[PDB]
Design a protein around this nucleic acid. Structure first.
Ligand SMILES: [Mg+2]
Lengths: 29, 70, 172
RNA sequence: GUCUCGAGCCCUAGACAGCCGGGAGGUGAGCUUAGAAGCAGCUACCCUCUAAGAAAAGCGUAACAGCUUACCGGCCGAGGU
């Protein structure tokens, strides 16, 4: 798991609380 | 309708030429109030939302010519 | 290895020895697929290309047989289309289809007509300046299309000045 | 050509390739120059919007334009380099 993917998955969660597979991994969270 | 940034710096500086070498040779000079006024003019030209980020684009032409900000 | 190919609803493929015959609404294409230890079969409605060996030389043909079958399916459904456009500069070249052979006359100012031959079933039909080679057997079509362009081969002079001849425009 | 073996790195958080889409603005960087606007030459090579996008890597133009290349997204699906 590369570092940039994790910084992005967490940045998408920052705009859910307030790639297509990177959105899905942020939806289940 | 609104003229370019390259032609807007020569009005409120003094000089009309650039330099033989950019950045290294300091020719023109600007200030704090002398950048926030050039930001009041450009709106459909810039992609920025804020009035803070709109200033960063004007500077992105100045340091590459030879301008020191006070 | 084994590769299972799904045959469409419009398609029907029959086997007799090492020969594969593919029938459909556009025609019937018969082919002979042969190579060491590779066996092709029809499991009711699926085509199976299987061999006990996994060496690169065998894998080369298993792959080639797949594209020979997959392309035979397109042959009996939609068909194969090669588009050609006749080009001339100074001489009024005439390309007319006579019998089971396409003929070109007055090429570069020649008294003698340049004639090729239509391979198999393939339909070569002309609409003025255009020509469209069509048929089910890609083997015959691609070759009949080639034969036409190649018939205007000029080795004796510079092709950059002497550009006369039918060329391929559309590749499927 | 083909066979066997080891090594580092990438990959279902979807790799490699291919096909599609996008390839943005401040801005034609500035100087040189009648002119040069990614791409003659000198020097710099900076920041906005964003999922990306070079002060442009390769061609192309008298110059634009055009075509791509880095770079992002999609399709696909298994190993790849
Ligand atoms: Mg000679």
């Amino acid at each position: 798991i590369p570092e940039w993917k994790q910084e992005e998955v967490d940045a998408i969660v920052e705009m859910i609380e307030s790639r297509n597979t990177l959105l899905e991994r942020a939806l289940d969270d | 309708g609104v003229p370019p940034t390259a032609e807007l710096i020569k009005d409120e500086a003094g000089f009309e030429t650039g330099s033989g070498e950019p950045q290294e040779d300091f020719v023109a000079d600007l200030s704090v109030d002398q950048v926030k006024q050039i930001a009041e003019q450009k709106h459909p030209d810039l992609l920025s939302y804020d009035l803070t980020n709109a200033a960063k684009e004007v500077v992105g032409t100045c340091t590459s010519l030879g301008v020191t900000i006070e | 290895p084994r590769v299972e190919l799904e045959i469409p609803e419009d398609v029907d493929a029959e086997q007799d020895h090492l020969d594969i015959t593919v029938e459909g609404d556009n025609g019937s294409v018969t082919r002979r697929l042969w190579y060491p230890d590779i066996d092709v079969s029809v499991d009711g409605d699926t085509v199976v290309i299987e061999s006990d060996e996994d060496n690169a030389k065998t894998m080369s043909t298993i792959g080639t047989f797949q594209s020979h079958i997959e392309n035979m399916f397109h042959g009996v459904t939609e068909g194969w289309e090669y588009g050609m456009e006749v080009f001339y500069s100074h001489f009024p070249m005439q390309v007319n289809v006579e019998g089971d052979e396409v003929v070109i006359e007055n090429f570069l100012g020649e008294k003698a007509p340049r004639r090729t031959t239509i391979h198999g079933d393939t339909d070569v039909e002309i609409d003025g300046e255009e020509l469209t080679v069509s048929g089910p057997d890609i083997e015959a079509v691609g070759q009949t299309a080639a034969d036409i362009e190649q018939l205007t081969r000029i080795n004796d002079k510079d092709v950059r000045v002497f550009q006369d001849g039918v060329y391929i425009t559309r590749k499927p």
